[PDB]
Symmetry: C3
Subunit: 146 residues, 3 copies
Amino acid sequence: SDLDRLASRAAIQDLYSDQLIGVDKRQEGRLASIWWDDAEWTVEGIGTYKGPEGALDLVNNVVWPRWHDFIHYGTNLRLEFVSADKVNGIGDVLCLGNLVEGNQSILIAAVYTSEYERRDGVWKFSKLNGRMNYFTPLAGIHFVPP
Amino acid sequence: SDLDRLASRAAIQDLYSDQLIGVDKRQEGRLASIWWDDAEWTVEGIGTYKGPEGALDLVNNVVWPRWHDFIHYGTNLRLEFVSADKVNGIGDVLCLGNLVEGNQSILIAAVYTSEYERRDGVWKFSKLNGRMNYFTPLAGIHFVPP
Amino acid sequence: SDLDRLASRAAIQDLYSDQLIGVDKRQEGRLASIWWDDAEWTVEGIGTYKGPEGALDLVNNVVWPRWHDFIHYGTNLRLEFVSADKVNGIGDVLCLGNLVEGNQSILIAAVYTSEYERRDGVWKFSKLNGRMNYFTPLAGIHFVPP
């Protein structure tokens, strides 16, 4: 039904934004809430982490210690139904951040490839794959507060 | 109902984009249309402005004279229903602009924290709070037309 | 009906993201799928191209040869119904890219002005107009992969 399809798309759009906001604002509750326990988050070059606790392990131990702070701007999220209970997503993400190593500011252009599964009526992430197309140090530029 | 919830989210997503477009394109009609008369727009460091006329006072007298032009890219707008007639929003905004003072180009990363109220069936802004996390002059870079 | 309006908005939001993704990922199938045969895509300074084959002519012969690669981030897409079967869109697009000429990296801020028509129940593009407000070479910065 059109209504179910639209409600599903809204739920999935919220899951995806919750991933970005949870990682950026370092909100462990929001970030943990969006994953099935067997969901897999793979970062090219780092490895595969599983479920809510795997997601928190990745950001607390690998990602967050590498950065003073960053912001991820998600755009162009496009969803396709593989089946009534499985959705593919693709999204384009622009990340700006302050790297600890070398005190460098960095611009990252990434593509996020995602999968969502509905189980007993509820949608959550089943897969996330992040690939960086640009990883660009910004000579002479440092992102600073007012 | 799911239908009402989805219609409300669409109306609120339009209000929020109308704020950004109205300020960027300097469209006073669009910008005035989105506020209850008792809505409060607070900018950290500038103060609180009230309603459609307060919004126009802020941009005509404080913001627009400071800039030759700018563009605000809104992403990650995430809505939560506090009640059936009150919604909280959070959004991440990337702003690029040409400041009059010093002829500087600036990159701003901001978080917009918003509230919307439904009154007699209609949604409008009741609150907007803007906070800048990055305010970054861009040495050697000036945003210019083709 | 609210349901039809929401379903139409979702279809049109997908058309618009498909334009950006198709041009960026150089996916000819996705890019061709979104146009009526009499749709017109005008780029200020280049000309007017018609339909799916015109769209592919423009990107294969004029745009793609000029760039090693680029990415378009679409935000603030705002839709208005001119009639039940005709929709106006406006959108703000941030483009980052690597130009062949001079090996320059470029930041583009553009406004996309679009029209969509429903024919026998189906939505597709009838018009796209792209205008660049910023076309900014980035001295000392080159977008590179990890």
